[PDB]
Swiss-Prot record:
Organism: Arabidopsis thaliana (Mouse-ear cress)
Family membership noted in the UniProt record: Belongs to the terpene synthase family. Tpsc subfamily.
Protein name: Ent-copalyl diphosphate synthase, chloroplastic
Positions of Mg(2+) binding: D288, D290
Result when mutating H242A: Reduced activity, but no effect on substrate binding. Increased inhibition by Mg(2+)
Residues annotated to bind substrate: K156, K374
InterPro entries associated with the record: Isoprenoid_synthase_dom_sf (IPR008949), Terpene_cyclase_plant_C1 (IPR044814), Terpene_synth_N (IPR001906), Terpene_synth_N_sf (IPR036965), Terpene_synthase-like (IPR050148), Terpenoid_cyclase/PrenylTrfase (IPR008930)
Gene that specifies this protein: GA1
GO CC field: chloroplast
Domain notes: The Asp-Xaa-Asp-Asp (DXDD) motif is important for the catalytic activity through binding to Mg(2+).
Catalytic activity, EC: 5.5.1.13
Length: 678
């Protein structure tokens, strides 16, 4: 909580409060199509788009992404801008430098092995070349590398279902500028509600040139105004931006700083949610599975009511697809489907099918070394997918997922792929990463203090002689700290860790028979020599914890502590650790939620947790089924009771993670607790 830290938090809040239709970089290709429009008197309709072009040429004469050089991106943006400038006979200094760049680099188009192909390049690029030849621009139309691209365009055009494109909304509307022989009377019926052709400024500019439709013009006027002459390759991106910012702040481990602002963002997303899902932009007649899956997951996680029926439209013969009627299955979309499918409730068959499909799809891509995505160049997509394949959501503890994501997140260096390369500065942001590194390291420093205190407690109480090994001590501390990690929740974190250790000692030391258990239970109330000693350890520890909470927060929970341990002991002697830990955590909270221990919803959750937290595949699957019921109950909870339901889910996930991964935790424990980020 340095001043600098607080100011950084305030800067992220200012971002969140001020989101509108998307902070997205300008596409020179799209700006050039806007700049081509004739106002009606043989002058540009948008002189500020022509100015943008001339002002934003790169020093080598190209246009495009300055920080990620791609021949495809540079050559299509540069050709478009030269066509725009030459068409009006304006800015010849820039126009000629662009022609020089094109002449010198066109032969290099295919030089980069792993270069990602801009969307629609193979139709859009030859189309621009034919415009350029029409206005007599002297570039090498006969460059040898250009034989195979032109062949591809005619092939693509014969495959497009052009009659369907005129009847129902499809993704083809985003790219009309490379097509010929269109029927505008039909296509105008498919205009989006903001005047665009599927949120593409270039496609909309071409439509306007062919139809002079006023609603196309208003979409363009609005975009050119917002971006001071330029336009992006897709706009708006309001839903994409709202959803991805929430996802990134959550995964980076810093979302608790932004609770109010995140609620407002998700209220916005929910306002535009529909029974058919969503795309990147509100109020669309085309939806996509990546936006739909991300919004579904975040809305369900935050307690909004959403139906898994939204996914039905994307399913075909047991497989799932990014868009209806297209074969694309992007790694990132299927990753986001896999994440969403894990929030399925027991009755949601379509998500069970989606979970199987997307898990197996990603497993195969990983095996074949095809974890590469058409929509984005990321720092570490294989790392993200690898973690998701290895650690299901039911086993994913907050600090474990965050510790790995902070090393995967690309910050400002990720680049998205549209018709041209683009950036999303409020999704992919180095300041978020710096805040996340600082916060992670600050919490980790506190955990290291506590780990020293905990080892001193273990040694002073001689717990090694009551059957608790050093390796177990570290596991108990880790599961608690990786779950309840905040510096201000030390009391909850430490009561869970110490309680779990004492249950192990008591069980190891007195759990063998009914006599041994009675012996211990009697000594607890009475406080056989041995049982009295371990009993005093337990009692001393409860007293210290309640005293510390009283001195720090004024809350007296002593009687509550003893009641809960008493209840656990009764059942143990006869024959429920999950429920004991949940009560302990709730007791140490800086408020009073213990009034809920009697509530029907508490009792229901307690019944389920005691079935998860058992005293192997079959056992894991049994736990998952019970987990599924807990999730549905917890996620459907009243706001005041939310903290309690969250606690049940916390404890259960720690148990599930241990059951699944507990044979080989060493690298996770080291990264989470003992290796600083950065
Ligand atoms: C309508 C769009 C693409 C064109 C249609 C498609 C899909 C063609 C791939 S089919 P193909 O395999 O044949 O390859 P090409 O022919 O198109 O080059 C998407 C525009 C939106 C964005 C850029 C925002 C994405 C935000 N999302 C990441 C969250």
């Amino acid at each position: 909580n340095s001043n600098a830290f607080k100011e950084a938090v305030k800067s992220v809040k200012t971002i969140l409060r001020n989101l509108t239709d998307g902070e997205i970089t300008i596409s020179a290709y799209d700006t050039a199509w806007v700049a081509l429009i004739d106002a009606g008197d043989k002058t540009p309709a948008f002189p500020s788009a022509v100015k943008w072009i001339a002002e934003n040429q790169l020093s080598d004469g190209s246009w495009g992404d300055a920080y990620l050089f791609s021949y495809h991106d540079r050559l299509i943006n540069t050709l478009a801008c030269v066509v725009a400038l030459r068409s009006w006979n304006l800015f010849p200094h820039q126009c000629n430098k662009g022609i020089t760049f094109f002449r010198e680099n066109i032969g290099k188009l295919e030089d980069e092995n792993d270069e990602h192909m801009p969307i629609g390049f193979e139709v859009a690029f030859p189309s621009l070349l034919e415009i350029a030849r029409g206005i007599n621009i002297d570039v090498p139309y006969d460059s040898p590398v250009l034989k195979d691209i032109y062949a591809k365009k005619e092939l693509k055009l014969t495959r497009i279902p052009k009659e369907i494109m005129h009847k129902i909304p499809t993704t083809l509307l985003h790219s009309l500028e490379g097509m010929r022989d269109l029927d505008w009377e039909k296509l105008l019926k498919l205009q989006s509600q903001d005047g665009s052709f599927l949120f593409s400024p270039s496609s909309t500019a071409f439509a306007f040139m062919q139809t002079r439709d006023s609603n196309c013009l208003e979409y363009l006027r609005n975009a050119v105004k917002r971006f001071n002459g330029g336009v992006p390759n897709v706009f708006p991106v309001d839903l994409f931006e709202h959803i991805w910012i929430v996802d990134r702040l959550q995964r980076l481990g810093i979302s608790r700083y932004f609770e109010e602002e995140i609620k407002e963002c998700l209220d916005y997303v929910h306002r535009y949610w529909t029974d058919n899902g969503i795309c990147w932009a509100r109020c669309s007649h085309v939806q996509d599975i990546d936006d739909t899956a991300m919004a579904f997951r975040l809305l369900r996680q935050h307690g909004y009511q959403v139906s898994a029926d939204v996914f039905k439209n994307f399913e075909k013969e047991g497989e799932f697809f990014c868009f209806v009627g297209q074969s694309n299955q992007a790694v990132t979309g299927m990753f986001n489907l896999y994440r969403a499918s894990q929030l399925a409730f027991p009755r949601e068959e379509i998500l069970k099918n989606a979970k199987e499909f997307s898990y197996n799809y990603l497993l195969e891509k990983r095996e074949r070394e095809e974890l590469i995505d058409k929509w984005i160049i990321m720092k570490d997509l294989p790392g993200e997918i690898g973690f998701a394949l290895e650690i299901p959501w039911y086993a994913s503890l907050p600090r474990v997922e965050t510790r790995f994501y902070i090393d995967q997140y690309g910050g400002e260096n990720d680049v998205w792929i549209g018709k041209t390369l683009y950036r999303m500065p409020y999704v992919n942001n180095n300041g978020y990463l710096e805040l996340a590194k600082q916060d992670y390291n600050n919490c980790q420093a506190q955990h290291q203090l506590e780990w020293d205190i905990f080892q001193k407690w273990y040694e002073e109480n001689r717990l090694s002689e009551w059957g608790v090994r050093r390796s177990e001590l570290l596991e108990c501390y880790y599961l608690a700290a990786a779950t309840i990690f905040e510096s201000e929740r030390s009391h909850e974190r430490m009561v869970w860790a110490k309680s779990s250790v004492l249950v192990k000692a008591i069980s190891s030391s007195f759990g063998e028979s009914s006599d041994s258990r009675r012996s211990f239970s009697d000594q607890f109330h009475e406080y056989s020599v041995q049982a009295s000693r371990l009993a005093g350890v337990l009692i001393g520890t409860l007293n210290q914890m309640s005293f510390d909470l009283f001195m720090s927060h004024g809350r007296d929970v002593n009687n509550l502590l003893y009641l809960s341990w008493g209840d656990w002991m009764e059942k143990w002697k006869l024959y429920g650790e999950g429920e004991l830990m949940v009560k302990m955590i709730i007791l140490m909270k800086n408020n009073d939620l213990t009034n809920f221990f009697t509530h029907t919803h508490f009792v229901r959750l307690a019944e389920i947790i005691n079935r998860i937290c058992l005293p192997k595949e079959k056992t894991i699957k049994s736990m998952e089924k019970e987990m599924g019921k807990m999730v549905e109950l917890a996620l459907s909870e009243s706001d005041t009771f939310r903290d309690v339901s969250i606690t049940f889910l916390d404890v259960a996930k720690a148990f599930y993670y241990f059951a699944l991964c507990g044979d080989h935790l060493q690298t996770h424990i080291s990264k989470v607790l003992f290796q600083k980020v950065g």
